[PDB]
């Protein structure tokens, strides 16, 4: 009496199609709002609650919240986190000399694994905790679960569906990010070009 879920499958996809009018009308600018809705709903969930209908709910309610607030700057900071029942937690790259307290975690794609290790082994970040990560105006949500697994929620639109969630171990998560946010690299690329093509920012939130 239950739908297929993350308890038995490592990937679950929405029923809502990639080009459904609700998603097509809302732009890619709605991705950050949808990802904050994903944090809200997934941080409250257990693996067997995460089925295709829950992903559908994230998309629809995420778009509803986005339409209420639109009219663009669509950073996590532009949304009022209490309306998502979320709390922001301090989380940044203290090793980066340009970073300041209160900044998000910012770096190049090469720093992804380090970010995840700091997030998973930090006392200041309880579990479950979500990272909302933006690269080149596209956003994903990564849920760090107390069972050591990671849920990757990706609203980019894949295989004809509006979003999917994948449950990953540490190394598989690293490998999947390389596919979602491919790094730009060519012989002779400067660090200035690397920062311009390959930077991301991430915010940490909890319920």
Numbering used by the authors: 283 to 353, 358 to 493
Sentences from the paper on this structure:
By performing a comprehensive bioinformatical screen, followed by biochemical and structural characterization of interesting candidates, we were able to identify active members of this family in a wide range of eukaryotic species and a few host-associated bacteria. Due to the similarity to the herpesvirus proteins, we refer to this extended enzyme family as VTD (for Viral Tegument-like Deubiquitinases). While some VTD activities resemble viral tegument DUBs in that they favor K48-linked ubiquitin chains, other members are highly specific for K6- or K63-linked ubiquitin chains.
In the di-ubiquitin cleavage assay, Wc-VTD1 showed a strong preference for K6-linked chains. In order to gain insight into the functional differences of bacterial VTDs in comparison to their relatives from viruses and transposons, the structure of Wc-VTD1 was solved in the unbound form at 1.8 Å resolution as well as in a covalent complex with ubiquitin at 1.9 Å resolution. The tertiary structure contains nine α-helices and seven β-strands, adopting a fold with overall similarity to the viral and transposon-encoded VTDs. The catalytic triad is formed by Cys319, Asp440, and His442. The structures in the unbound and complexed state can be superimposed with an RMS distance of 0.538 Å over 144 Cα-atoms excluding some 40 residues, thus indicating little overall conformational changes upon binding to the Ub-PA substrate. On the opposite side, helix α1 (residues 302 to 305) together with the following amino acids 306 to 311 is also shifted by a distance of about 8 Å. However, helix α1 itself does not seem to be involved in direct interactions with the bound substrate. It is located on the surface rather distant from the active site and is involved in the crystal contacts between the two crystallographically independent molecules in the apo structure. In fact, the available structure and mutagenesis data suggest an attractive three-step model for explaining the K6 specificity of Wc-VTD1: In the apo-form, the α1 and α9 helices are far apart and the catalytic histidine residue is in a non-productive conformation.
